[PDB]
Design an enzyme around this catalytic site. Structure first.
Site, PDB file in Angstrom:
ATOM      1  N   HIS A   1      74.473  21.468 -20.178  1.00 32.11           N
ATOM      2  CA  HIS A   1      75.443  22.259 -19.435  1.00 32.11           C
ATOM      3  C   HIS A   1      76.474  23.030 -20.292  1.00 32.11           C
ATOM      4  O   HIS A   1      77.581  22.573 -20.607  1.00 32.11           O
ATOM      5  CB  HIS A   1      76.232  21.322 -18.543  1.00 32.11           C
ATOM      6  CG  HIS A   1      75.539  20.854 -17.342  1.00 32.11           C
ATOM      7  ND1 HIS A   1      75.007  19.576 -17.203  1.00 32.11           N
ATOM      8  CD2 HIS A   1      75.344  21.459 -16.163  1.00 32.11           C
ATOM      9  CE1 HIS A   1      74.581  19.405 -15.982  1.00 32.11           C
ATOM     10  NE2 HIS A   1      74.754  20.529 -15.330  1.00 32.11           N
TER      11      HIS A   1
ATOM     12  N   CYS B   1      70.210  22.998 -15.970  1.00 31.56           N
ATOM     13  CA  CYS B   1      69.992  21.591 -15.451  1.00 31.56           C
ATOM     14  C   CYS B   1      69.206  21.608 -14.133  1.00 31.56           C
ATOM     15  O   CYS B   1      67.982  21.853 -14.144  1.00 31.56           O
ATOM     16  CB  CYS B   1      71.300  20.881 -15.421  1.00 31.56           C
ATOM     17  SG  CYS B   1      71.097  19.075 -15.384  1.00 31.56           S
TER      18      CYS B   1
ATOM     19  N   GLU C   1      78.243  25.573 -19.480  1.00 30.11           N
ATOM     20  CA  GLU C   1      79.351  25.959 -18.593  1.00 30.11           C
ATOM     21  C   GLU C   1      80.290  24.811 -18.367  1.00 30.11           C
ATOM     22  O   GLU C   1      81.421  25.082 -17.927  1.00 30.11           O
ATOM     23  CB  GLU C   1      78.833  26.437 -17.265  1.00 30.11           C
ATOM     24  CG  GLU C   1      78.392  25.410 -16.268  1.00 30.11           C
ATOM     25  CD  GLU C   1      77.077  24.575 -16.570  1.00 30.11           C
ATOM     26  OE1 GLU C   1      76.421  24.736 -17.633  1.00 30.11           O
ATOM     27  OE2 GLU C   1      76.683  23.906 -15.612  1.00 30.11           O
TER      28      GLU C   1
HETATM   29  N1  LIG Z   1      73.615  17.998 -13.545  1.00 31.05           N
HETATM   30  C1  LIG Z   1      72.373  18.388 -13.118  1.00 31.05           C
HETATM   31  O1  LIG Z   1      72.106  19.550 -12.846  1.00 31.05           O
HETATM   32  C2  LIG Z   1      71.331  17.267 -13.002  1.00 31.05           C
HETATM   33  C3  LIG Z   1      69.982  17.647 -12.447  1.00 31.05           C
HETATM   34  C4  LIG Z   1      69.241  16.498 -11.736  1.00 31.05           C
HETATM   35  N2  LIG Z   1      69.958  15.991 -10.584  1.00 31.05           N
HETATM   36  C5  LIG Z   1      68.968  15.365 -12.732  1.00 31.05           C
HETATM   37  O2  LIG Z   1      69.681  14.397 -12.708  1.00 31.05           O
HETATM   38  O3  LIG Z   1      68.072  15.492 -13.513  1.00 31.05           O
END
Ligand SMILES: NC(=O)CC[C@H](N)C(=O)O
Ligand SMILES: Nc1ncnc2c1ncn2[C@@H]1O[C@H](COP(=O)(O)OP(=O)(O)O)[C@@H](O)[C@H]1O
Ligand SMILES: [Mg+2]
Ligand SMILES: [Mg+2]
Ligand SMILES: [Mg+2]
Length: 1298
Positions: free
Chosen positions: A1263, A1138, A1265
């Site tokens: 994600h 992410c 994890e």
């Molecule tokens: N949960 C995250 O890693 C999000 C990554 C970034 N802040 C986005 O919203 O795209």
């Protein structure tokens, strides 16, 4: 001294759908605008020159965002910027980035939007209406030249203290200051100050009076809740506060702290708390009690003026209270509440809605439900706490209530934020403050924000002025608060060596309340130096410095000898802090000013903190008569349709998927339920740790419209519904359930004061003690009314008395939680009707949707039966006898049944003949209770169990859930109501459809809505290419040889702990590596064979998500080289998830084999997407996905900038032909998709993970994890064990290292 401003042109700012939205709005207002084009513009205020290398660095830092097509500017320039004298949060973050990239020459960066408008005529009057559409008048200004942006950076000299000339003018000096400064002092407060300063023989300074005024506001002092009362001529024995404390006197069980902090604490569970050791930097489990803190508050006044920051700072402030519990604690999960007037969505007006007008100077209910949820979510997302339960009510009607026919509603809204956190046992009690303790402000440099918010929130909305309106405009920087939370976490993770002696939030009154509160709570005084406070506004007066309500600040006391440790901790997190005073033995408050060589404050604390007499409220009962429901135009079928269109009832996705639900990896039960991810869960559940099935639950109960007929019934229903919402969670003893009671009222409005008293007594002296419910925390907001002039006439909109109850509980086993998701195995549906056949229709959704109040509302009918219901439910949960549960609330049994059918994607066949002859009342009453589903073979045993708890006569066999699409209600041989389940589900979705359509990319909104009408959607479903249970890392782990993984984090990362824990489970020693650790030489990547870049909001995604993190690496040649070296080693492995994916995408130049990687940019929907999305694993070299190719399973998605963007079609084709795509979004039919929200972000060919040519580096937006534990998967197959399919990624990494 001398500064210079550079102008740097940015990228095109608006997508085509937003450009067309503006053109349609100009067209609709008869402004002949032919074309509009917008570009971002950046303004850099420099304290020294940039060389060519530094300038190219700055230019590169200011390249970000979607690659929209650029146009040569044409037509009239209107530049929108923050208003002069204000600094955007964008500026704070963009400037940090410039500094961490070694550009110390940058004093400040700011941004504007340059609009270029080609129009026809346009009188200069019509040009003002154009300008009005392009900016927010509460926060921004419009300029005609780019060079006008110099005005944003003007240097101002500090303004001096002003004295108020009591000695030279007498009391009139105080009267004049009272008016001029808006102190809102009562006469007896003016008397107190007159005498205090007379006795001291000196004039008060403005700052001293202002400080006093904010501390003695209703908002801060809670005079109403501490008042004596006389009701219908009889003195009462207890204050409202004391009636609430009665519940603690009766039920102290499990409570560790109540009424002594800004949060209550209760016992939790002994579990493994997972964090990185101070000495080793290694993440390890620490087996110990994880106790549970809870708090709920409001931000109602400022949200009526500026809803995004009002909502955002409401969350912000509540999160500070949680973290500042005891001697430091950790926020875990949030809740959110809104109450507003009718939305009146253009083109979607509903038949109960009438426009009654509003004050010019507040925003509409629609504007609050548009911007407000986005601000709250912006904070929770950027800070990094999941938002898991909530409410949303609309109410605005002319009703015959307690004070006769009046407008009742929410023009001043309820904007509610709450949550739970975890705390260590030895940190629950605040410490003593040693003489000589250092007094610190942790957090953001202040500005003149929110000054007088205490007094301003102590009065009604509307009829204000421009200056007080500007002072109600808040400002949020969540990433600043995350940095502070990290320091707090390092502190409490030192255990017995936690250096925090005392900590508190900085809220209303700013430092002027918080620092005196802190020394006073320790029995000390303080002496402070004004010029040691961090400031971003050098022009401020001492009054402004000391009293402003700037955000993201805490106060704390530390021993002098712990300052070096504190400084280390702060610097590693990049959390700003300042020592600004010393605790003294003398109970005096001194504030010195080194600049002006004088003493703005010099007061004994007993003078400053002394109280005028207690209030006495002498009031009278009013009771509404209430009129029987006129059923002339009501039919069952029409009522169904209307009720499903009431926002309070209707689907809430617009409020749900905007907010992260998975950060921490401890979310077991979020709002979305089942394969069709329908937002109907009745309560939230988290796990207590990453290694336990013990946990915590949150629920809400509220029923304000009922208070228009019966104050006490409304408060009893709020508690009863909090219980019925939580009841299908495995808790045990009802005394484990603890409540926050949040009271909203228009104090002084006829009938309301007595009603409030009656309602507090109903729950505090009666219902909660009889049930064994403690209320160990709470708050009140006592000016819930709005007044304005509408033509020649006075108008007023007053809220019902609105109690919101939040319930919190330790959970015995999170696995055993039931949801509304009906099974179609052989089954029985049983109604538990706690209404005992009363079937009340007063103050229901039904009544509301026909513009009426009705006669008699629901109520708690039988206290023992309510307790028996809870205990029976706990028995059935523990014995695993329930297939499903859904409680009855807004919309009645009709809505409970419909929502279960929606969640189970099935039909029901139910008969209601036993529930009375009045079918409308049986179906639409909002009495307590709900529907259980049990296995058919268990029906008789379940009925006998219910009977043991005294419930037999409330229990009714309704029928069964059945495969298919029919929702059928019979009574004997008559069909009462019959409709397609899909038709009803779509109707129930139309509100969120229309909200998303107006707020987001309407194409996405429409796709999501239309998918709901296809009954053939099979829901989320899995196909596995491997054995989910086979621990392929086990032979490695069994050797005891544990390779290190560098768990990489930057400021604003918030997803590192659960990332560490995933690798831990796979046999790694997870090491906490901050970017400051690399920059400081404390860690070298040469000592690692694996690295993971974690998720979050580094730098608040300012300058493009992941870009500041990456460019900080690239611009430091030492650290740049270090990363390059690591990626060019032959066997090293790296994962970017992410924010880490975005960061690594911006570091391509250091990563071999990455030349075809795409960029990740703003989602197509133009909205943050928190989804549980279906992906398939595709064939690629990725070593971390070995064995998993062809698998399809859902995964946590939580991002706003996840859309793959390629340079051109050639780039996409090359990437695809190289075979480096590793994951793709699929729809539930299993096909690769670009349709929303199956593909949440618009990525071509569903792409959401890529790898390198060698397979050694993989980056992905979702994600894994967050969902490596089965229990953390919103929906999953029933037969899964502890591990989800995603655990295989980390096990693959371990096996690969050998
Ligand atoms: N949960 C995250 O890693 C999000 C990554 C970034 N802040 C986005 O919203 O795209
Ligand atoms: N303001 C909000 N923010 C987030 N989730 C919300 C909000 N309002 C409602 N929800 C969620 O949507 C679902 C339906 O809400 P609602 O119908 O009000 O719940 P109930 O009727 O069970 O009290 C729930 O899971 C609830 O937590
Ligand atoms: Mg509901
Ligand atoms: Mg419910
Ligand atoms: Mg509810």
């Amino acid at each position: 001294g001398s500064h210079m401003m550079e102008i740097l042109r940015g990228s095109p700012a608006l997508s085509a759908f937003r450009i067309n939205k503006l053109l349609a709005r100009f067209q609709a207002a008869n402004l002949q605008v032919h074309n509009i084009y917008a570009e971002y513009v950046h303004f850099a205020d420099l304290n020294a020159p940039l060389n060519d290398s530094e300038q190219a660095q700055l230019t590169r830092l200011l390249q970000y965002g979607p690659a929209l097509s650029s146009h040569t500017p044409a037509g009239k320039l209107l530049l929108v910027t923050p208003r002069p004298g204000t600094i955007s949060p964008w500026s704070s973050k963009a400037t940090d980035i410039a500094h961490n990239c070694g550009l110390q020459q940058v004093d400040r960066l700011e941004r504007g939007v340059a609009y270029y408008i080609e129009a026809s005529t346009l009188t200069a009057e019509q040009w003002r209406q154009v300008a009005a559409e392009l900016h927010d008048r509460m926060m921004e200004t419009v300029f005609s030249s780019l060079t006008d942006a110099e005005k944003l950076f003007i240097h101002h000299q500090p303004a001096p203290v002003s004295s108020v000339d009591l000695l030279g003018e007498g009391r009139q000096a105080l009267i004049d200051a009272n008016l001029r400064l808006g102190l809102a002092l009562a006469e007896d407060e003016i008397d107190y100050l007159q005498e205090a300063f007379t006795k001291l023989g000196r004039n008060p300074n403005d700052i001293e009076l202002y400080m006093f005024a904010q501390a003695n506001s209703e908002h801060c002092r809670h005079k109403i809740f501490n008042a004596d009362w006389i009701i219908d001529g009889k003195p009462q024995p207890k204050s409202l506060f004391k009636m609430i404390k009665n519940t603690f006197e009766t039920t102290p069980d499990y409570v560790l702290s109540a009424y002594k902090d800004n949060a209550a604490v209760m016992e939790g569970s002994a579990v493994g708390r997972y964090f990185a050791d101070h000495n080793t930097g290694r993440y390890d489990f620490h087996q110990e009690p994880a106790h549970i803190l809870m708090k709920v508050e409001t931000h109602n006044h400022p949200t009526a003026i500026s809803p995004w920051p009002g909502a955002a700072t409401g969350s912000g402030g509540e999160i500070r209270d949680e973290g500042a519990t005891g001697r430091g604690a950790k926020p875990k999960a949030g809740l959110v509440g809104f109450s507003v007037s009718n939305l009146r969505i253009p083109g979607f007006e509903q038949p109960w809605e009438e426009d009654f007008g509003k004050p010019e100077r507040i925003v509409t209910a629609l504007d609050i439900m548009t911007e407000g949820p986005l601000g709250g979510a912006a904070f929770n997302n950027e800070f990094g706490r999941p938002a898991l339960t909530g409410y949303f009510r609309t109410y605005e009607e002319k009703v015959n209530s307690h004070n006769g026919e009046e407008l009742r509603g929410y023009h001043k809204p309820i904007m509610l934020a709450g949550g739970i956190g975890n705390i260590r046992a030895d940190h629950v009690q605040k410490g003593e403050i040693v003489v000589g303790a250092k007094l610190i402000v942790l957090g953001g440099p202040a500005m003149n924000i929110g000054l007088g918010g205490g007094a301003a929130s102590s009065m009604a909305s509307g009829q204000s002025d421009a200056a007080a309106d500007f002072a109600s405009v808040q400002r949020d920087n969540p990433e600043m608060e995350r940095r502070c939370q990290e320091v707090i976490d390092r502190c409490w993770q030192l255990g017995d060596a936690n250096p925090i002696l005392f900590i508190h939030d900085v809220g209303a009154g700013g430092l002027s309340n918080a620092m005196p509160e802190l020394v006073s709570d320790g029995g000390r005084g303080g002496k402070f130096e004004l010029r040691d406070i961090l400031s971003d506004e050098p022009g401020m007066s001492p009054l402004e410095i000391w009293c402003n309500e700037s955000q993201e600040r805490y106060v704390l006391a530390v021993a002098a000898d712990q300052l070096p440790l504190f400084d280390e901790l702060c610097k590693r997190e990049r959390a700003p802090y300042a020592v600004i005073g010393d605790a003294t033995e003398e109970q005096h408050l001194s504030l010195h000013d080194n600049h002006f060589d004088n003493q703005p404050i010099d007061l004994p604390l007993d003078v400053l903190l002394g109280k005028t007499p207690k209030m006495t409220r002498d009031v009278q009962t009013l009771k509404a008569k209430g009129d029987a429901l006129n059923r002339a135009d009501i039919t069952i079928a029409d009522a169904v349709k209307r009720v499903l269109h009431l926002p309070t009832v209707a689907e809430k996705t617009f409020l749900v998927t905007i907010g992260d639900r998975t950060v921490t990896g401890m979310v077991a039960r979020d709002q979305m339920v089942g394969p069709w991810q329908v937002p109907v869960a009745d309560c939230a559940v988290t796990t207590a740790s990453l290694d336990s099935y013990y946990g915590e639950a949150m629920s809400i109960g509220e029923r304000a419209p009922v208070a228009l007929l019966d104050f006490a019934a409304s408060a009893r229903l709020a508690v009863g519904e909090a219980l019925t919402n939580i009841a299908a969670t495995q808790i045990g003893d009802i005394k484990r359930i603890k409540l926050s009671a949040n009271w909203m009222a228009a104090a002084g409005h006829p009938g309301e004061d007595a009603g409030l008293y009656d309602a507090v007594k109903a729950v505090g002296e009666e219902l909660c003690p009889q049930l064994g419910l403690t209320i160990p925390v709470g708050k009140d907001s006592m000016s819930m009314k709005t007044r304005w002039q509408e033509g020649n006439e006075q108008r007023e909109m007053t809220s019902p008395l609105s109690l919101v109850i939040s319930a919190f509980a330790r959970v015995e086993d999170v696995r055993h939680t039931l949801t509304p998701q009906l099974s179609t195995e052989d089954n029985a549906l049983l109604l538990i009707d706690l209404g005992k056949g009363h079937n009340a229709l007063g103050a229901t959704a039904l009544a509301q949707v026909y513009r009426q109040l009705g006669d008699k509302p629901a109520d708690v009918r039988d206290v023992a039966q309510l307790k028996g219901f809870y205990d029976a439910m706990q028995a059935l949960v523990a014995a695993r006898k329930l297939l499903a549960w859904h409680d009855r609330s807004d919309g009645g049994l009709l809505v409970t049944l419909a929502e279960m059918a929606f969640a189970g994607h099935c039909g029901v066949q139910v008969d209601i003949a036993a529930l009375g002859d009045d079918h409308l009342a049986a179906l639409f009453n909002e009495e307590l209770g709900g529907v259980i589903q049990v296995r058919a073979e268990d029906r008789d045993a379940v009925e006998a169990l219910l009977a043991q708890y005294g419930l037999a006569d409330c229990v009714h066999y309704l029928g069964q859930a059945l495969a298919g699409d029919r929702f059928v209600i019979t009574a004997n041989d008559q069909t009462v109501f019959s409709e397609s389940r899909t038709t009803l589900r779509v109707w129930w979705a139309e509100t969120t459809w229309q909200m998303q359509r107006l707020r987001d990319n309407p194409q996405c909104a429409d796709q999501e809505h239309e998918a709901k009408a296809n009954d053939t959607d099979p829901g989320l479903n899995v196909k596995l290419s491997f054995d989910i249970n086979e621990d392929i890392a086990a032979p490695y782990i069994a050797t005891g040889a544990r390779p290190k993984v560098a768990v990489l984090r930057e400021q604003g990362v918030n997803s590192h702990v659960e990332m560490a824990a995933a690798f831990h489970r796979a046999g790694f020693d997870a090491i906490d590596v901050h970017m400051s650790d690399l920059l400081g030489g404390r860690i070298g990547l040469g000592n690692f064979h694996a690295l993971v870049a974690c998720g979050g909001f580094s730098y608040g995604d300012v300058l493009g998500a992941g870009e500041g993190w990456a460019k900080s690496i690239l611009f430091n040649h030492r650290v740049r080289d270090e990363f390059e070296t690591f990626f060019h080693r032959p066997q090293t492995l790296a994962l970017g998830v992410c924010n880490g994916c975005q960061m690594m995408s911006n570091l391509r130049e250091l990563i071999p084999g990455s030349e075809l990687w795409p960029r990740f940019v703003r989602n197509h929907s133009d909205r943050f997407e928190a989804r549980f999305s279906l992906v398939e694993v595709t064939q690629s070299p990725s070593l971390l996905l070995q064995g998993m190719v062809g698998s399809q399973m859902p995964i946590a998605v939580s991002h706003g900038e996840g859309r793959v963007e390629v340079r051109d079609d050639a780039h996409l084709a090359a990437l695809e032909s190289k075979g480096l795509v590793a994951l793709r979004y699929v729809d539930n039919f299993g096909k690769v998709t670009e349709t929303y929200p199956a593909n949440p972000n618009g990525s071509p060919n569903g792409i959401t993970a890529v790898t390198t040519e060698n397979g050694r580096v993989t980056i992905m937006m979702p994600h894994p994890e967050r969902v490596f534990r089965t229990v953390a998967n919103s929906w999953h197959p029933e037969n899964w064990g502890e591990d989800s399919p995603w655990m295989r990624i980390f096990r693959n990494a371990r096996k690969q290292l050998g």
